[PDB]
Enzyme design. Structure first.
Site, PDB file in Angstrom:
ATOM      1  N   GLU B  21       0.830  -1.187   0.000  1.00  0.00           N
ATOM      2  CA  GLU B  21       0.000   0.000   0.000  1.00  0.00           C
ATOM      3  C   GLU B  21       0.886   1.267   0.000  1.00  0.00           C
ATOM      4  OE1 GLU B  21      -0.657   2.760   1.878  1.00  0.00           O
ATOM      5  OE2 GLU B  21      -1.982   3.202   0.167  1.00  0.00           O
ATOM      6  N   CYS B  68      -5.881   4.510   5.602  1.00  0.00           N
ATOM      7  CA  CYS B  68      -5.569   3.362   4.792  1.00  0.00           C
ATOM      8  C   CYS B  68      -6.790   2.528   4.579  1.00  0.00           C
ATOM      9  CB  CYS B  68      -4.511   2.511   5.468  1.00  0.00           C
ATOM     10  SG  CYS B  68      -3.929   1.281   4.326  1.00  0.00           S
ATOM     11  N   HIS B  75      -7.958   1.812  11.986  1.00  0.00           N
ATOM     12  CA  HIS B  75      -7.914   3.207  12.433  1.00  0.00           C
ATOM     13  C   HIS B  75      -9.226   3.697  13.025  1.00  0.00           C
ATOM     14  CE1 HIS B  75      -3.856   3.913  11.038  1.00  0.00           C
ATOM     15  NE2 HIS B  75      -4.169   3.323   9.899  1.00  0.00           N
ATOM     16  N   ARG B 472      -0.492  -5.218  10.754  1.00  0.00           N
ATOM     17  CA  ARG B 472       0.918  -4.842  10.601  1.00  0.00           C
ATOM     18  C   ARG B 472       1.623  -4.456  11.913  1.00  0.00           C
ATOM     19  NH1 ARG B 472      -2.176  -4.285   6.616  1.00  0.00           N
ATOM     20  NH2 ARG B 472      -1.514  -4.949   4.540  1.00  0.00           N
ATOM     21  N   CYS B 539       2.710  -0.251   4.561  1.00  0.00           N
ATOM     22  CA  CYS B 539       1.572   0.577   4.240  1.00  0.00           C
ATOM     23  C   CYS B 539       1.988   2.039   4.424  1.00  0.00           C
ATOM     24  CB  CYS B 539       0.386   0.230   5.133  1.00  0.00           C
ATOM     25  SG  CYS B 539      -1.158   0.886   4.530  1.00  0.00           S
ATOM     26  N   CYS B 542      -0.721   4.444   5.719  1.00  0.00           N
ATOM     27  CA  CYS B 542      -0.698   4.244   7.152  1.00  0.00           C
ATOM     28  C   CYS B 542       0.487   4.940   7.802  1.00  0.00           C
ATOM     29  CB  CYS B 542      -0.578   2.751   7.467  1.00  0.00           C
ATOM     30  SG  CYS B 542      -2.124   1.927   7.814  1.00  0.00           S
TER      31      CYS B 542
HETATM   32  N1  FCO Z   1      -2.145  -3.014   9.810  1.00  0.00           N
HETATM   33  C1  FCO Z   1      -2.086  -1.956   9.317  1.00  0.00           C
HETATM   34 FE1  FCO Z   1      -2.164  -0.172   8.649  1.00  0.00          FE
HETATM   35  C2  FCO Z   1      -0.270  -0.038   8.819  1.00  0.00           C
HETATM   36  N2  FCO Z   1       0.877   0.038   8.903  1.00  0.00           N
HETATM   37  C3  FCO Z   1      -2.431   0.299  10.287  1.00  0.00           C
HETATM   38  O1  FCO Z   1      -2.712   0.611  11.363  1.00  0.00           O
HETATM   39  O1  LIG Z   2      -1.994  -1.731   5.989  1.00  0.00           O
HETATM   40  O2  LIG Z   2      -1.532  -0.760   6.969  1.00  0.00           O
HETATM   41 NI    NI Z   3      -2.744   0.278   5.956  1.00  0.00          NI
END
Ligand code: FCO
Ligand SMILES: [O-][O-]
Ligand code: NI
Ligand code: SF4
Ligand code: SF4
Ligand code: F3S
Ligand SMILES: [Mg+2]
Lengths: 262, 545
Positions: B21, B68, B75, B472, B539, B542
């Site tokens: 990502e 994200c 989140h 993550r 990410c 993120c």
């Molecule tokens: N898992 C995930 Fe996205 C990231 N790095 C978040 O919080």
């Molecule tokens: O996927 O942070």
């Molecule tokens: Ni993410």
């Protein structure tokens, strides 16, 4: 003619929820789409090549003799000459500008590419813009945060097989965005009867009362959520939560506070 | 063997890093075919923290969820936990159960997609699958995985035929210019394994849809759930019989695929790439934990997380420390932010963007550098696995040992890119083993009482933290409320920990450190960099937010 129409997909200032939404398609599934229907010739989230090889893949696609359709995901950060959003050392705005130039058609998947999206919300530190504003061309907008894969793949197939579908005043296909969420809401009789949940813990909430007093923007939001649902199972109001108006331009600032109608 | 390595001396830049990502640029200096220095350069800033200032704390979760869409939900969850803490509300049991089940569904979706659709193409040569005999492949599948019709010769032939027609068309789409085209020294798998992995890659495209459907039963939709509210959840329907029956039915399908395809594929690959157990290791691990039986406060989350919280330093599995939320801070010395922002606890967080130029060694990322008592911390599946393992968490102990045995390696082999990759599957299997228990717990509870949201009051002035262990790793949202509005809102995100730049002491981040010692078989096609980078499951949306 055996050739599959070439699609280039750019990621700009985005959260990738639109890519994620597209791969939730079931009519057809994504494998069938990219094996039988289109040639997805650039897509950073899933493509094998990286770095210079990915960059050559893009350039190959953009120079394709049959031309290509452009899908844009994310808004365009324009501050400091576009440098807050870069791919392969180039400002996103520069690359999208270049891809758009010779595109057969441009589809903006999501509210970010259509209208600017979350990064454009005040005080817009990156000076983010929607694609049409940034490039100065008409785009086919498939908004929502993210849009239903039904709406995006629907649009994509329409464009390739039928042509440009009829668009509303904000560039949204009428097939999908021609009706208010509210007009197809199962809670509509409660709204008509003035039966509103005053809070999420209330017995009214438990009884599935209308969510307008809790900020539901269904009445000012064009989308097909209650009709087609998401993931074949649900949608926000069915899950007891007000609509945020996430398919409307600049909703982060026009539809907030989300829990009020003020 | 041994591990292919060129004689290359010079810089390598990989931009874009695909199959993640967000927008990452990796810069490395290579000497004699091994990486000697590294830089993790995040290439997009959006500035959600700036955007949140002055807004209604209730709105936060909807803004921050858009940090994200790959790790959608997490989140929203962290923001809701954060605001719940700020207003001092204790969510009802049902809300804790539903929020945790949704997290579980997110783990399943996320890890399945990452392995197959992001990571596998670093290990699997898809075009080589066309060289495989489908009968030889069927036989090998029987010897590396459970019996399933999907692994039949007929089913593997059909995949091969689909792929062949695709490749014969000349339109390679997402395989255009793959690093494995024409063969590559760093790809070891027999064509039979490539065929098997590729078959599952296609199946997983269908399976992730089901995983997302299960999540949407409780979450309202996917991507971007819409069922959390301050004080709990809105989704009374998610407590009822038929939806929970369907939720369990879809999750069992997903979990069967995790056990039949994902783990076997992971172990097969792991067996071929055993040399990767000595590549890409780090030293320090941090987890906030997840799946708590008591989420009444951050302290109760840390203590009652069924995937336990903790801190490992220097690979010392004999000493897991408690998490000290006061010892977290972020540096910006090597980041694209104004000078003077170093060493900020997230409650005092500052987000003041200041770009310089590309590949500026003094400022080279839009990520902050989170540090813990001065130390970079690896977070995510590997951190969780080690912490759970060290603590004798029975499910982790059983699964880790099943893996160490099958691969005939010591646990110390897990401090590596291979371990990091394997850890992700290990925890996926454990989530899967827990689903029916968790679902049953909530079904039974919601039947008895359908309370889902608590009463609460917005305070004039306050602060709170919401912790989660996202797919993550350790995620935290920190709010200051002043005048009933957001005064400060800071996100400190797992990819920030993992893929951020150097801290104020010039100390490399986990990904930067993991990259040191990466062998490069072919500088023109540096898959090894991708293997390690992808193992962290980056990410950038993120990380930077
Ligand atoms: N898992 C995930 Fe996205 C990231 N790095 C978040 O919080
Ligand atoms: O996927 O942070
Ligand atoms: Ni993410
Ligand atoms: S429109 Fe929404 S889901 Fe799509 S990229 Fe933007 S923030 Fe993400
Ligand atoms: S819940 Fe929203 S969309 Fe449904 S009737 Fe009430 S205001 Fe309209
Ligand atoms: S928030 Fe968005 S997804 Fe549909 S229900 Fe409202 S338009
Ligand atoms: Mg932050």
């Amino acid at each position: 003619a055996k050739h599959r129409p070439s699609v280039v997909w750019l990621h700009n200032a985005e959260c990738t929820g639109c890519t994620e939404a597209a791969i939730r398609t079931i009519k057809p599934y994504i494998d069938a789409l990219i094996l039988d229907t289109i040639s997805l010739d650039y897509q950073e989230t899933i493509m094998a090549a990286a770095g210079e090889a990915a960059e050559a893949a893009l350039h190959q696609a953009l120079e394709g003799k049959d031309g290509y359709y452009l899908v844009v995901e994310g808004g365009l950060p324009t501050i400091d000459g576009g440098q807050w959003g870069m791919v392969a050392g180039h400002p996103m705005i520069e690359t999208t500008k270049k891809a758009a130039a010779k595109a057969k058609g441009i589809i903006c998947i999501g509210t970010c590419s259509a209208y600017g999206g979350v990064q454009k919300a005040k005080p817009n530190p990156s000076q983010a813009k929607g694609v049409s504003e940034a490039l100065g061309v008409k785009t086919i907008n498939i908004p929502g945060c993210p849009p239903n894969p039904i709406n995006f793949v629907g649009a994509v197939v329409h464009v390739l097989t039928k042509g440009i579908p009829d668009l509303d005043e904000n560039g949204r296909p009428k097939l999908f965005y021609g009706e208010l969420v509210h007009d197809n809401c199962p809670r509509l009789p409660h709204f008509e009867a003035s039966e509103f949940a005053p809070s999420f813990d209330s017995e009214e909430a438990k009884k599935g009362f209308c969510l307008y007093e809790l900020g539901c923007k269904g009445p000012v939001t064009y989308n097909n959520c209650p009709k087609v649902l998401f993931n074949q199972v649900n949608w926000p109001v069915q899950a007891g939560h007000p609509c945020l108006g996430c398919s409307e331009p600049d909703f982060w600032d026009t539809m907030t506070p989300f829990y009020e109608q003020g | 063997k041994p591990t292919p390595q060129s004689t290359f001396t010079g810089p390598i830049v990989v931009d874009p890093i695909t199959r993640i990502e967000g927008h990452l640029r990796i810069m490395v200096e290579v000497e004699n075919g091994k990486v000697k220095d590294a830089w993790s350069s995040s290439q997009l800033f959006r500035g959600l923290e700036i955007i949140l200032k002055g807004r209604d704390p209730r709105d936060a979760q909807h803004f921050t969820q858009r940090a994200c869409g790959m790790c959608t939900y997490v989140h929203a969850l962290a923001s809701s936990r954060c605001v719940d803490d700020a207003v001092k509300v204790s969510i009802p049991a049902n809300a804790r159960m539903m929020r945790n089940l949704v997290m579980a569904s997110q783990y399943l979706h996320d890890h399945l997609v990452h392995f197959y659709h992001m990571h596998a193409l670093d290990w699997v040569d898809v075009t080589a699958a066309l060289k495989a005999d489908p009968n030889k492949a069927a036989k090998l599948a029987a010897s590396i995985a459970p019996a399933r019709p999907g692994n039949s010769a007929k089913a593997l032939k059909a995949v091969q035929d689909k792929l062949k027609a695709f490749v014969e068309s000349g339109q390679l789409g997402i395989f255009t210019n793959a690093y494995f085209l024409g063969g590559h020294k760093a790809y070891y798998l027999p064509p039979e394994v490539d065929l098997i992995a590729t078959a599952h890659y296609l199946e997983a495209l269908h399976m992730q849809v089901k995983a997302a459907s299960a999540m949407a039963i409780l979450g309202g939709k996917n991507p971007h759930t819409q069922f959390t509210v301050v004080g709990g959840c809105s989704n009374y329907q998610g407590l009822t019989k038929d939806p929970l029956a369907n939720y369990l039915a879809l999750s069992k399908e997903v979990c069967q695929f995790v056990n039949e395809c994902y783990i076997p594929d992971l172990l097969a690959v792991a067996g071929f790439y055993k040399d990767w157990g000595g590549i890409g290791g780090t030293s320090n691990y941090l987890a906030f934990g997840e799946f708590a039986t008591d989420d009444s406060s951050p302290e109760k989350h840390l203590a009652t997380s069924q995937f336990p919280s903790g801190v490992i330093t220097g690979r010392d599995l004999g000493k897991v420390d408690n998490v000290d939320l006061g010892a977290i801070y972020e540096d910006v010395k090597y980041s694209w932010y104004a000078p003077g922002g170093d060493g900020k606890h997230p409650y005092d967080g500052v987000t003041d963007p200041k770009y310089t130029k590309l590949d500026d060694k003094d400022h080279y990322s839009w990520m902050k550098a989170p540090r813990y008592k001065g130390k970079a911390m690896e977070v995510g599946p590997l951190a969780r696995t080690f912490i759970a393992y060290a603590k004798g968490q029975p499910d982790f102990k059983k699964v880790v040992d099943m893996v160490l045995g099958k691969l005939s390696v010591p646990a110390t082999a897990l401090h590596s890119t291979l371990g990091r990759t394997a850890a992700r599957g290990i925890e996926t299997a454990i989530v899967c083993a827990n689903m029916e228990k968790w679902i049953k717990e909530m079904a039974d509870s919601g039947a008895k009482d359908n309370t889902l949201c608590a009463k609460w009051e917005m305070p004039e002035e306050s602060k709170g933290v919401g912790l989660a262990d996202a797919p993550r790793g350790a995620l935290s949202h920190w709010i200051r409320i002043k005048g009933k509005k957001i005064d400060n809102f800071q996100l400190v995100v797992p990819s920030t920990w993992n893929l951020g730049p150097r801290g104020a002491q010039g100390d490399k981040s986990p990904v930067e450190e993991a990259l040191i010692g990466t062998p490069i078989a072919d500088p023109k096609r540096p898959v090894e960099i991708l293997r390690t980078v992808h193992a962290f499951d980056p990410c950038i949306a993120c990380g930077v937010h």
